Amino acid sequence: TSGSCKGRCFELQEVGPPDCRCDNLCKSYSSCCHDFDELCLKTARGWECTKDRCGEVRNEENACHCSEDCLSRGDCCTNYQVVCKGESHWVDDDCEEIKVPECPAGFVRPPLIIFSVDGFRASYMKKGSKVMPNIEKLRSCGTHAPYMRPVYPTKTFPNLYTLATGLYPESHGIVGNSMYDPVFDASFHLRGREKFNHRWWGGQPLWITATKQGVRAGTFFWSVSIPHERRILTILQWLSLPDNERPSVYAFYSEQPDFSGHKYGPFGPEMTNPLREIDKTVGQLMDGLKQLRLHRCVNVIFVGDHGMEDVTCDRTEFLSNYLTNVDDITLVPGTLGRIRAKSINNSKYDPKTIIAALTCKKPDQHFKPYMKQHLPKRLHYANNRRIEDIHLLVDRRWHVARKPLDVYKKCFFQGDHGFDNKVNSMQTVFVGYGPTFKYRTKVPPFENIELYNVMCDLLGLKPAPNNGTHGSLNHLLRTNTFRPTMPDEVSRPNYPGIMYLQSEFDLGCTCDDKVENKLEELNKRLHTKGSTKERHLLYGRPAVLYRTSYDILYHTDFESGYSEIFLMPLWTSYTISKQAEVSSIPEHLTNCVRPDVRVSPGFSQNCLAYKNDKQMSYGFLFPPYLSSSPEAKYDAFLVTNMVPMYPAFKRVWAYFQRVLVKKYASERNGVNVISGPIFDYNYDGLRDTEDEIKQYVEGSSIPVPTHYYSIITSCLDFTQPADKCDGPLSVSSFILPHRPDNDESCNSSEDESKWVEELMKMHTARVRDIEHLTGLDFYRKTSRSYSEILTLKTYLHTYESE
């Protein structure tokens, strides 16, 4: 470490060791040159020009300069021009639209500066507005969302690395603020050097995507000791490098307001200061850019990782209050719980009994236990060996801790984060400002997984495969690199006619249906042939994006895509107008299941299988309850409308079909509903192939769904009915887990009106989540632009307050 940093402070291109370093990571590696702080971390005279300093003789020891050569040397204090040249601060200037990039010669593309702020809760934009004039100018003049949804867990590393990669934590591998990997036999902590081993960090983050494609990056790590002022001056110096050396993408990171927020709560009186400070740093950057003539050239993204909630020690739940075998578990504690065996050499560890002991045990309990595969699918928090089989979702405002000793042998804090990512307090911020973003534009809330695609667009890069839906944020941008196209249908449907006689079927099924007009039979003929298909299929048939064998089946009240491989529909589509009336399954038709004369015995389910199977009953995708007439109801009992359902789950499903659909049709002015099965036995969030199914209705080839979905669409303008909508659509969807019990809902021994809807809300989902899980592609035929449809497909209905 004997070498010098002279003239190589914060050098971008790296050197070969044991040879001393001068970059942000050097303190962490103990590899800094002995003159690092002296040369690279000057502080003399502070950060601002004062009037007396103007035009001075250059003293190389000052932190920044007011000397005449400073603009060209690229190292003035950010307020130099204001003080020494009578320029105005960036914030005081009117905002003027940036129609085209106004860049100095040599700039091949507008730079991107990612200004990331830790714990910057969405509502600070309104609530701290009086003290954040620079940020508020960015926000009102550029493009902003009311809030941006983080990913689960709403911790710092999982979310910054999601921003950088477009990946769910389960895919990028940073699934928590601390992690045990069972194959590394290693722990990853906020403290320590293990976290610096590359083996934890999957996917391809923006700085690597940028390099691999010939675009240079400034640092995406800043030392905690390096003050924010020196961080801004470093970015400003790099922006003054020669064309061949100068990076195109930059990052800034603020520890605030998160650092304070943990101490004082999200709205503690001590929070106003951190917000003033962040604002001042933004002011410095914008003043700096304006000096360099870059303030109408650079795209600036102001983005937070997660919000902040009120959490205190006395609001902790202790596992020792639930389990007696509390010493046989390791818990990752806090705003989420992850339990594994304290030792794998122990074959006396039983997760089922742990779960059981943690379920609805206290009238008011503030967490809920889940096997990871049972977590709401919208959290995408299962497909990683680092995520423990046992998970606890903790209520907002609470903590889980193992024993009382852990909170008083380790009250300090008033704020925390990490809860479910639909929680209002966890929402964070997005503002984009620059030539490539729109002018004075509000966009709807979106998920942070979408940004990697946009940052690649902004930089002319081709994104690595990721979890955003590329095009879903084209409406943020003035000019678009990416023009999305609908994927091609892989399998085209069959359209079978009447090909089988009743007596050919031997399904163990029975129906009371043999009751004694010519016009009446041509009417019904037109039905089985797609007459009301434009009423029940409002957005075109979904496209199957994989290779398979399936039949389109028309009926009076509904239309389906019936899979000959899975022996049940992939999808069933139907419209319930506001006027539509509910009826009951008449008594003689309770056990009614009818063969479908369009589909072979061999590609049909049978009732026998359901008899012999003591666990499994069955339900219907189009609900009998909602048939338009007594004759049409017979359609609802076709064996091709049937699906396997646990009796426990039928309680949920029956309430949704009998009560909730009609309610939605009344509130929304008609709804269109597409429901179907989902198979995700390997919990990867993607459609299972046949050979992945772990469970069949006993002694049959009838596969059992892990989940059931519905997509419920209507007109955004609810003065128009769902079936005659001229403009933007409105959607909400869910993916309900197909479970043999209702342990998840503590009050399920009450009437369905007390719990079912609360459960469905918990399992709300994006249409895009259902697409991954089914291999289907929806909304193929609408009057809407494809970009708008992508936005709709990424929409999540969250059921939170405002």
Ligand X SMILES: *[C@@H]1O[C@H](CO)[C@@H](O[C@@H]2O[C@H](CO)[C@@H](O[C@@H]3O[C@H](CO[C@H]4O[C@H](CO)[C@@H](O)[C@H](O[C@H]5O[C@H](CO)[C@@H](O)[C@H](O)[C@@H]5O[C@H]5O[C@H](CO)[C@@H](O)[C@H](O)[C@@H]5O)[C@@H]4O)[C@@H](O)[C@H](O[C@H]4O[C@H](CO)[C@@H](O)[C@H](O)[C@@H]4O[C@H]4O[C@H](CO)[C@@H](O)[C@H](O)[C@@H]4O)[C@@H]3O)[C@H](O)[C@H]2NC(C)=O)[C@H](O)[C@H]1NC(C)=O
Select from 155-163, 236-244, 358-366, 483-491 the region that touches ligand Y3B (CB under 6 A): 155-163
CB of 155 to Zn ion, least distance (A): 7
Question: Pairing state of beta strands 143-149 and 441-442?
Answer: parallel
388 binds, among Ca ion, K ion, ligand Y3B, none (CB under 5 to 8 A by kind): none
Q: Which is nearer to ligand Y3B, 195 or 470 (CB)?
A: 195
Question: Residue type at 113?
Answer: I
Q: Is 270 in the site for Ca ion (CB under 5 A)?
A: no
Q: Which of 269, 415, 400, 424 is nearest to 338 (CA)?
A: 400
Alpha helices in 239-350 (DSSP H): 258-264, 272-291
CA distance 486 to 682: 27
Which tokens in the block code for residue 616? 């499994």
680 binds, among ligand Y3B, Ca ion, ligand X, none (CB under 5 to 8 A by kind): Ca ion
User: Is 306 annotated as a binding-site member?
Assistant: yes
Sign, CA dihedral 176-303-12-108, equals positive
Q: Is 164 in the site for ligand Y3B (CB under 6 A)?
A: yes
Q: Which is nearer to Ca ion, 178 or 774 (CB)?
A: 774
- Evaluate whether 574 touches 587 at the Cβ level (below 8 Å): no
Q: Is 752 in the site for Na ion (CB under 5 A)?
A: no
Residues in 213-272 that interact with ligand X by CB under 6 A: none
Q: Is 156 in the site for ligand Y3B (CB under 6 A)?
A: yes
User: Is 527 annotated as a binding-site member?
Assistant: no
Cα 315–chain centre separation: 28
Residues in 510-549 that interact with ligand X by CB under 6 A: none
Q: How many residues bind ligand X (CB under 6 A)?
A: 17
752 binds, among Na ion, Ca ion, Zn ion, none (CB under 5 to 8 A by kind): none
CA distance 159 to 150: 7
- Evaluate whether 778 touches 784 at the Cβ level (below 8 Å): no
708: left (phi over 0), alpha (psi -120 to 50) or beta: beta
Q: Is 682 in the site for Ca ion (CB under 5 A)?
A: yes
- Evaluate whether 340 touches 351 at the Cβ level (below 8 Å): no
Point out the residue whose Cβ comes nearest to ligand X.
202
| Residue for token pair 């984060």 | 417
258 binds, among Na ion, ligand X, Zn ion, none (CB under 5 to 8 A by kind): Zn ion
User: Is 189 annotated as a binding-site member?
Assistant: no
384 binds, among Ca ion, ligand X, ligand Y3B, none (CB under 5 to 8 A by kind): ligand X
Residues in 277-296 that interact with Zn ion by CB under 5 A: none
User: Is 305 annotated as a binding-site member?
Assistant: yes
Residues in 166-205 that interact with ligand Y3B by CB under 6 A: 177, 190, 195-196, 198, 201
Q: Is 685 in the site for ligand X (CB under 6 A)?
A: yes
CB of 380 to Zn ion, least distance (A): 22
- Identify how many contiguous H helices and E strands the chain contains and give both numbers: 23, 28
- Give the torsion through C-alpha atoms of 118, 124, 129, 134, to 10 deg: 20
Applying CB under 6 A, among 171, 248, 316, 714 the residue interacting with ligand X is: 171
User: Is 417 annotated as a binding-site member?
Assistant: yes
User: Is 763 annotated as a binding-site member?
Assistant: no
HEC letters along 82-114: HHHHCCCCHHHCCCCCCCCCCCCCCCCCCCEEE
Q: Is 116 in the site for ligand Y3B (CB under 6 A)?
A: yes
Distances in Å between the Cα of 581 and the Cα atoms of 254, 369, 557, 628, 636 are 57, 39, 13, 8, 16
Select from 190-198, 206-214, 320-328, 736-744 the region that touches Na ion (CB under 5 A): 736-744
User: Is 684 annotated as a binding-site member?
Assistant: yes
3-state secondary structure (DSSP) of residue 730 = strand
Q: Is 258 in the site for Zn ion (CB under 5 A)?
A: yes
Q: Which is nearer to Zn ion, 136 or 258 (CB)?
A: 258
Other C-beta atoms lying within 10 Å of the C-beta of residue 765: 22
CB of 616 to K ion, least distance (A): 5
| Interaction mask 597-636, K ion, x per CB under 5 A | -------------x--x---x-------------------
Q: Is 172 in the site for ligand X (CB under 6 A)?
A: yes
CA distance 624 to 110: 59
Q: Is 160 in the site for ligand Y3B (CB under 6 A)?
A: yes
CA distance 595 to 605: 9
Cα 288–chain centre separation: 35
- Evaluate whether 560 touches 646 at the Cβ level (below 8 Å): no
Cα 736–chain centre separation: 18
Applying CB under 6 A, among 251, 678, 735, 792 the residue interacting with ligand Y3B is: 251
Applying CB under 6 A, among 81, 281, 425, 467 the residue interacting with ligand X is: 467
CA distance 592 to 53: 92
Which tokens in the block code for residue 589? 């038709």
Q: Which is nearer to ligand X, 511 or 693 (CB)?
A: 693
- Evaluate whether 577 touches 670 at the Cβ level (below 8 Å): yes
Gap between the terminal Cα atoms of the chain: 55
Q: Is 309 in the site for Zn ion (CB under 5 A)?
A: no
Q: Which is nearer to ligand Y3B, 177 or 573 (CB)?
A: 177
Select from 206-214, 270-278, 379-387, 483-491 the region that touches ligand X (CB under 6 A): 379-387
> Which are the catalytic amino acids?
156
Q: What are phi and psi of 223, to 5 degrees?
A: -70, 140
Applying CB under 5 A, among 24, 31, 733, 742 the residue interacting with Na ion is: 742
CA distance 781 to 276: 50
Annotated binding site for Zn(2+): 118, 156, 258, 262, 305-306, 417
Annotated binding site for 1-tetradecanoyl-sn-glycerol 3-phosphate: 156, 177, 258, 417
Annotated binding site: 118, 156, 177, 258, 262, 305-306, 417, 680, 682, 684, 686, 688
What residue ranges bind ligand X (CB under 6 A)?
167-168, 170-173, 202-203, 380, 383-384, 465-467, 685-686, 772
